[PDB]
Amino acid sequence: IDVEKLLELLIKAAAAEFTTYYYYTILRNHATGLEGEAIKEIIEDARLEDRNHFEALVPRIYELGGELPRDIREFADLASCRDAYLPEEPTIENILKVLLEAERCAVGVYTEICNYTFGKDPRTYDLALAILHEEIEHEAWFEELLTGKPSGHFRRGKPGESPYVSKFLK
Amino acid sequence: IDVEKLLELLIKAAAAEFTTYYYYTILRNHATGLEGEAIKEIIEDARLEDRNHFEALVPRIYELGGELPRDIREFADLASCRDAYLPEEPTIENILKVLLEAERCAVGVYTEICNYTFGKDPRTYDLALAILHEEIEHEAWFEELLTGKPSGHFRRGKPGESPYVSKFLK
Amino acid sequence: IDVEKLLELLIKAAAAEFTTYYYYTILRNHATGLEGEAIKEIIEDARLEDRNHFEALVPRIYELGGELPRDIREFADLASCRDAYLPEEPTIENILKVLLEAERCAVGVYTEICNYTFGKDPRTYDLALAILHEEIEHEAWFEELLTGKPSGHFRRGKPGESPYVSKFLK
Amino acid sequence: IDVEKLLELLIKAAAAEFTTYYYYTILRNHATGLEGEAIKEIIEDARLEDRNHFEALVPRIYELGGELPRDIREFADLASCRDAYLPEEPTIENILKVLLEAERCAVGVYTEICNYTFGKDPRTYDLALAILHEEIEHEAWFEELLTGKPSGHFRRGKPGESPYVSKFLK
Amino acid sequence: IDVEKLLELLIKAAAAEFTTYYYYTILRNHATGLEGEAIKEIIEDARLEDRNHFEALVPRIYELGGELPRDIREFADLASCRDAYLPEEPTIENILKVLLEAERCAVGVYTEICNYTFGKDPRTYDLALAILHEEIEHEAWFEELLTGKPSGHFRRGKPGESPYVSKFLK
Amino acid sequence: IDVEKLLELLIKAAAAEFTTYYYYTILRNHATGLEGEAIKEIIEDARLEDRNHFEALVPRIYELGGELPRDIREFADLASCRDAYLPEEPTIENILKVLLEAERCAVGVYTEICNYTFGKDPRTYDLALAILHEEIEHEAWFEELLTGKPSGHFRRGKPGESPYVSKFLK
Amino acid sequence: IDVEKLLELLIKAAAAEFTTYYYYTILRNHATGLEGEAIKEIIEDARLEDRNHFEALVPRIYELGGELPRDIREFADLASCRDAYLPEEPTIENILKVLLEAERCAVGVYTEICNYTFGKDPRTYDLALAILHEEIEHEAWFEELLTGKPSGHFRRGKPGESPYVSKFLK
Amino acid sequence: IDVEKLLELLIKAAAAEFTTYYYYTILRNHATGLEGEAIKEIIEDARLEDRNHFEALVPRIYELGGELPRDIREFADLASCRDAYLPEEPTIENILKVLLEAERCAVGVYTEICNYTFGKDPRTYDLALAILHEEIEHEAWFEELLTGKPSGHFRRGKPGESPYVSKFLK
Amino acid sequence: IDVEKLLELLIKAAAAEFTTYYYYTILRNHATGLEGEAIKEIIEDARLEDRNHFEALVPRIYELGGELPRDIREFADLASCRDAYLPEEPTIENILKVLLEAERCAVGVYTEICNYTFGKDPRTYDLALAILHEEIEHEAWFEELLTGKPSGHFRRGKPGESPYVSKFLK
Amino acid sequence: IDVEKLLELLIKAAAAEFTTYYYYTILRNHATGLEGEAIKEIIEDARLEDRNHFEALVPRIYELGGELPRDIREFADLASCRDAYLPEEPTIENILKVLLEAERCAVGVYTEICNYTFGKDPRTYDLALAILHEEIEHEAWFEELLTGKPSGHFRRGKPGESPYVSKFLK
Amino acid sequence: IDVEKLLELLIKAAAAEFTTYYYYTILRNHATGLEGEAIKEIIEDARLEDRNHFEALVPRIYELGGELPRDIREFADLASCRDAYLPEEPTIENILKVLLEAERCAVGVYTEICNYTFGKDPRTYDLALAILHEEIEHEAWFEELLTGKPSGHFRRGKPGESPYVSKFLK
Amino acid sequence: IDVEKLLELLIKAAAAEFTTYYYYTILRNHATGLEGEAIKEIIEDARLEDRNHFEALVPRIYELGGELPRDIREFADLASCRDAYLPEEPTIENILKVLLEAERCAVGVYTEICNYTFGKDPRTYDLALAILHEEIEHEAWFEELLTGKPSGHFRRGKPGESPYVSKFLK
Ligand SMILES: [Fe+3]
Ligand SMILES: [Fe+3]
Ligand SMILES: [Fe+3]
Ligand SMILES: [Fe+3]
Ligand SMILES: [Fe+3]
Ligand SMILES: [Fe+3]
Ligand SMILES: [Fe+3]
Ligand SMILES: [Fe+3]
Secondary structure, three states, rough: OOHHHHHHHHHHHHHHHHHHHHHHHHHHHHOOHHHHHHHHHHHHHHHHHHHHHHHHHHHHHOOOOOOOOOOHHHHHHHOOOOOOOOOOOOHHHHHHHHHHHHHHHHHHHHHHHOOOOHHHHHHHHHHHHHHHHHHHHHHHHHHHHHHOOOOOOOOOOOOOOOOOHHHHOO | OOOOHHHHHHHHHHHHHHHHHHHHHHHHHHHHHHHHHHHHHHHHHHHHHHHHHHHHHHHHHHHOOOOOOOOOOHHHHHOOOOOOOOOOOHHHHHHHHHHHHHHHHHHHHHHHHHHOOOOOOOOHHHHHHHHHHHHHHHHHHHHHHHHHOOOOOOOOOOOOOOOOOOHOOO | OOOHHHHHHHHHHHHHHHHHHHHHHHHHHHHHHHHHHHHHHHHHHHHHHHHHHHHHHHHHHHHOOOOOOOHHHHHHHHOOOOOOOOOOOHHHHHHHHHHHHHHHHHHHHHHHHHHOOOOOOOOHHHHHHHHHHHHHHHHHHHHHHHHHHOOOOOOOOOOOOOOOHHHHHH | OOHHHHHHHHHHHHHHHHHHHHHHHHHHHHHHHHHHHHHHHHHHHHHHHHHHHHHHHHHHHHOOOOOOOHHHHHHOOOOOOOOOOOOOOOOHHHHHHHHHHHHHHHHHHHHHHHOOOOOOHHHHHHHHHHHHHHHHHHHHHHHHHHHHHOOOOOOOOOOOOOOOOHHOOO | OHHHHHHHHHHHHHHHHHHHHHHHHHHHHOHHHHHHHHHHHHHHHHHHHHHHHHHHHHHHHHHOOOOOOOOOHHHHHHOOOOOOOOOOOOOOHHHHHHHHHHHHHHHHHHHHHHHHOOOHHHHHHHHHHHHHHHHHHHHHHHHHHHHHOOOOOOOHHHOOOOOOHHOOOO | OOOOHHHHHHHHHHHHHHHHHHHHHHHHHHHHHHHHHHHHHHHHHHHHHHHHHHHHHHHHHHHOOOOOOOOHHHHHHOOOOOOOOOOOOOOOOHHHHHHHHHHHHHHHHHHHHHOOOOOOHHHHHEEEEEEEHHHHHHHHHHHHHHHHOOOOOOOOOOOOOOOOHHHHHO | OOOOHHHHHHHHHHHHHHHHHHHHHHHHHOHHHHHHHHHHHHHHHHHHHHHHHHHHHHHHHHOOOOHHHHHHHHHHHHOOOOOOOOOOOHHHHHHHHHHHHHHHHHHHHHHHHHOOOOOHHHHHHHHHHHHHHHHHHHHHHHHHHHHHHOOOOOOOOOOOOOOOHHHHHH | OOHHHHHHHHHHHHHHHHHHHHHHHHHHHHHHHHHHHHHHHHHHHHHHHHHHHHHHHHHHHHHHHOOOOHHHHHHOOOOOOOOOOOOOOHHHHHHHHHHHEEEEHHHHHHHHHOOOOOOOOOHHHHHHHHHHHHHHHHHHHHHHHHHHHOOOOOOOOOOOOOOOHHHOOO | OOOHHHHHHHHHHHHHHHHHHHHHHHHHOOOOHHHHHHHHHHHHHHHHHHHHHHHHHHHHHHHHOOOOOHHHHHHHOOOOOOOOOOOOOOOOHHHHHHHHHHHHHHHHHHHHHOOOOOOHHHHHHHHHHHHHHHHHHHHHHHHHHOOOOOOOOOOOOOOOOOOOOOHHHO | OOOHHHHHHHHHHHHHHHHHHHHHHHHHHEEEEEEEEHHHHHHHHHHHHHHHHHHHHHHHHHHHHOOOOOOOOHHHHOOOOOOOOOOOOOOOOHHHHHHHHHHHHHHHHHHHHOOOOOOOOHHHHHHHHHHHHHHHHHHHHHHHHHOOOOOOOOOOOOOOOOOOOHHHHH | OOOOHHHHHHHHHHHHHHHHHHHHHHHHHHHOHHHHHHHHHHHHHHHHHHHHHHHHHHHHHHOOOOOOOOHHHHOOOOOOOOOOOOOOOHHHHHHHHHHHHHHHHHHHHHHHHOOOOOOOOOHHHHHHHHHHHHHHHHHHHHHHHHHHHOOOOOOOOOOOOOHHHHHHHH | OOOHHHHHHHHHHHHHHHHHHHHHHHHHHHHHHHHHHHHHHHHHHHHHHHHHHHHHHHHHHOOOOOOOOHHHHHHHHHOOOOOOOOOOOOOHHHHHHHHHHHHHHHHHHHHHHHHOOOOHHHHHHHHHHHHHHHHHHHHHHHHHHHOOOOOOOHHHOOOOOOOOOHHOOO
């Protein structure tokens, strides 16, 4: 494995998770009214688990000899996803669209990392797989709410449970 | 008490609970969208408690000298209720209709067993009464969601609590 | 501080909390249907915390040399708020209107008590402040549900948590 | 069963429990001195369990198609017991007399409901029986304290345990 | 109900439970070897739950105006069962025979009490029913071990759980 | 990956787990006598974990765009294993034979799914691997009991622990 | 050590604890009125810990090759203490006298066993010492209540804690 | 704020709490007999919470640049209260008099500190307020026991709970 | 109070906390070697509590009618503190210098907010006071490590305890 | 006490415990079949508690100025017991013979240490006594399984409880 | 035993523990800087356990008919150790010297008490032994930190665990 | 896969873990002084997790048809690592060198096993991967302490947590 490339991938994914922890706060606060109370706890579940994803990526970055960038704006500019901005018309459907685009991008990032470390770096692969479980379940929550396609998921009992990444957490 | 008749009643009710544990899984997965997120945890609450009802009926069946049937298809064909099939147009209102018919039938089954063992078999009566509490509360949840008639119930804190049948559970 | 005036304020506020514990029960039971399941746990959260507010006001009343009135009808007639009556047309929006008027009055009562005991009676001030936190958060829940204005609150994990008044509770 | 009669009985008993939750607060605060510290926790135990009795009666009332009355004064005027007023000479013995009259009336109310729903409405019967256990134990506590007749009861570990009605509570 | 007769029944049953708590200790210690390790935890489960049965009968005896007899030998001589003596040849099969005779007698005692208080004394009936659940499950454990007839019971997780009588325990 | 083939494999394996949850109940109840008490908790451990396997397979099926079949008999007819029928001579050795054939088939099913999704679908692979851990340990328990070959496993502390699949459970 | 003598001492002390568990039940129920509520929890604390003393003595008896006697009346007749009979005039002071005589005898029994096994049988010595701690604290509770001599003890948080003998308990 | 003056106040109050932790031990041990068992747990509650007050004052003293005095006798000589000496005639009423004088002095000390840091040092003010809550509740317990004036307080569940100062404790 | 000014103050302080949560991660990772292991848990304690400070500021911002800025770079540019950059020579002493400058600035920010809302906005004042407690204790930890001045603080038991702000957290 | 002799005794006993932790693993894995499932948890209980014995001996060795030997083979060669080798014919009875010889030797080792430190080194004596309790109970388990002599012991609830040595453990 | 001599020894040792609880607070606060953070939790562990030693000595003093002295200065003047004064040059090494002298004196005090009550007063002996365990482990912590001699101890998980004296604590 | 080769690898790795559990005890005890207290808990964390690694390897060895060797010296001679001997000059830096060589060897062993079972034996691969996570984190702890290279790890909350291997543990 070319380890500088994996370090770029991992830093970009961790910037995606950190920015996501911010933008989801904003999105959570605008899920308002009767429809929004339905999706608020789900946004909060995804936001806390994603910040846990950041908390799991950083130790692996420093394991491989990389560092987080000096400036937090450099970090934000490195995000592998685009910013989950609040829509101009922040309806519940428009917000769900933004959240679904974010978790679809996140699934792709971690699929890319797993397809990079498969049979080559088992620790990073296992970590990217653990985050990929939770990003797939994030995408399913928001795609069932926005489109109605049944994907059989439930709401975590408490936000930030992160059942698949917890063994990388303290 | 004619104990073969009570054994038929109890086996038929346990087949109702086992099939219900399956069909409610299917119904749970199709409660989708913004309206469905409202009723999903309630379907899950009823599904887990009903499978707990099966888990409480089987020991009493073997107490009285009966057995579950050899083949699982024989068992399913013995269900005292009709199959809670997914409706052809699986809207939230049509699904609530199916769930309400299932829990109304279940209330009738356990009313029948209690009216059979009253003053005659106190253990089976107490057990049928404990399940009857939870089936009455299932019916009330779904009738408040479908019709709006206030029956004063809340959502269990965690699915499968089964507060009335727990003392028959392990 | 004129302590008979503070005792009137505190008794009137405790009658507001006790009556509110009753009327919110009624309002909780009529939050029915698909929209009402969304607001039921929020009504229950506010009802239990408000009865906890009564449970915190009574010890301070007897600290200052006051008593609850002999007759429970005298007590109800002393409520600093108006009765959160069930609306003639008990829709979800009309019920939210009633709940929001009740929690807006409650915020005003406890603002008045804090503006009375500020720098003068620190124990009563701290207690009125603790209740005022929870009444402000009640008002925000119901104003976000009724109007959509984002005020950034979540649902307590379990009803009656009363995180700000708990240190006055047993 | 004539269900309007059972609804009257159940509403009157729930008004008895709600008023009792108020009047026992007052009685608790006047159990003072060296003798009163002995009976205070017992008054608190009975007060919290009785308010739990109210919390268990209301869901059954709305199950059967009844409602709590619109006005809280109507409710108080419906109490099946007389008001546990603070005695004119509020000695420990006079207060125990009042508490014993209240719990003797409560035992009679729930005996009446059980004698009404026996073999006829098993859910309401089971609920009235669960409250009747705790009202019998309330009467025994206060009759042992006032007269010395041994009835073999202990103090609940924590107030409001309600071991017999808990399965109807949330 | 003739209450002196019910007091005799209840005192005799409580002597049965107290003596049983002793004799089961002895029987537990002689369940030795490879076969006995299988039945030891089951003997211990039944012994602790039976002593819990004594702990639940005594408060009801003093509720009804009765007392335990002055002398512990009078008490032992009042046991409604015969003494679960260690067999002359204390094999695992002979010990199981003794345990099964004891729990069959206990089922009969509590069936007799329930058939006495049915529709007449609901508190004592509920208590006798709760003990009767656990005595029926004791009989089933020992009859499955001695004869092999399937009655579908499992081993309690911890001895003395007493899931049916716990609400009468402190 | 041809996703309809993986959906067939996953539905067939989930029917195997659901039928197994039924048939193991029956097998559990006939593990009787002194020898059977030894294997009962082990049957119960495997039965509960297998029903947990069903509870983990269904969300992945609806993730991939599949559904459980409409009718529960269709589902049972799709089981990748043969029915763990009670043997004609239900001795402890014959029952162990049936249980060992069932868990050997289950190991083969999940080996097949893992050999299908390896390096191709990491979420389904991880899930099939988690179930495969527990099916390998089921096979080892029953092969040590039936043949005596040491495979170094212990009994789970509580049934249905499912230590490897729990992160897919709620 | 002459081990038959130590076995006599240990069997006599265990009969003292078993009879005490009975007689303290009776004494507990007659600690009535305002004064008795003060001493009831203390009687209950001593009763449960003493029955725990029986539960710790029996394993050591069977360790040393002894057995509990065949008949429970033989056992009661072997008690190293005299029977804590209910006094003819069962006042709170007379009951405290009886309880203090019982715990003074118990302190003497275990002092005798410790003075027997000192430097000779360390396991039995440690066990007799652990019971002797709790019997000394029982005597101090009852001597402070009856005479007022300060011995600095508090009430255990929950009855039957047995902090010194717990490591011999299961 | 003149910070040396606040440091004197805080050191004097912490010496009051440390000496109080000693003298309350002595007072606790002499609350003997039937009346004293009533007040013992209340003395223990106040003693442990007061030693917790010392544990909260010391970090704030070292925050502000002060130190505890070198010698423990200097410290004791700095106590803002007078020594809660055991009365010459240590009756329950005389001991309650001493305890009430101590907690009345403590309320005055912390009122003085709060009136010093109000709007000037918010951390010390909040800390002095938290201790002042618990000292007001100490005074109320002892004034209700000694005089009978109802102040509506209960006994903490466990000694040293310190619900208001706990957030300053470790 | 001019509420736009308080909203600026609160948004700037929340940007300080969010950036601090990032920069402290970086600082935590470079506290290396034998000296750094001493300060790592303290950096982690401060980092988690500061991110909790962000989690408490956002609900109050949306209460007062403000919002977090659309872009995360705008947010970072609004931080009331300067960026806790990793020093060019990242020794343990240089890192402690940076951490101490950050927590000294944070103490000043929250002193400014409290001096703004004192007697004017009690909810925001209480919140700013709760954060100010934890920022004062952060400054004391780092000033004791860097200079040796005794300020009497200990290490929180687990990172992110936030004992003073927890009642604002979920 | 000659402390080099006590250090030899303690090092030899700790080598006995460490080797025993290995050999019991092997013995545990060969307790197979229907008889072996009975004794497996008992072997596991003894193995974990014995490794806990090693964990308690090492701190006392370094207290007295001794060390564990440099090489792990030197350590194994110092074991005060002989190696609990797997028997050539590893039947359940032959394995029980080996386990009983090991725990009989262990009882003798710790009897020797206690007879060495009695009245001379109280810390080491107390530690050797705590291990001696658990070794006596190990011997009793295996002697009841192999010979049937009743010694009145039960199975620890969870392996490695070590109730007597836990206060020396971390 | 001459009990006045043992009472002197026990009162002097309890004054040593109480003064130590004060002086260790002071010593804890001056363990500053990078080296001091290493020893702070160890000082806190010893300080809390020593105050627990005081909490265990007082009940035994009042058991034997002794009392704590009337005045707290008399008590401090009775300390069996010398005052653990802050050194004139309070370096980490000088502070460790003071702490090691204090715990060496404490080991000698409790060795003296055990050598006094050996075979003569088993309760006091057991108590002095329990404190002597913890004082030996205190001495080992400080002697390993000051000199480097390996004595194999670890840091208690939480301060004031007091694993050996806890059974004397409430 | 050639299964005898994998059995050699797994037995050699389990001997590495068992010997490591011994040698780390020795290394832990010599991490003395002010610097050593910093690294002691980290040595203890690694030692307990490594012994947990042994506890996870043995069941997989007996799954695959292998056994631990008859003699514990044969086992030690099979260790895939070299013995982590105490250095001749046991400074903190020399001890860290030894620990880092041990965990670097362990990372290589488990990398070798994973590179052997990849896509071939998924259970053993998953197990070797779980141990490899914890061995990589062991190496990072010791390399950050010895060299200062930031690898972003923290100290486990309690020793032997083994977050990655726990699902293989009981
Ligand atoms: Fe993410
Ligand atoms: Fe059902
Ligand atoms: Fe019984
Ligand atoms: Fe006793
Ligand atoms: Fe104080
Ligand atoms: Fe901050
Ligand atoms: Fe000490
Ligand atoms: Fe390892």
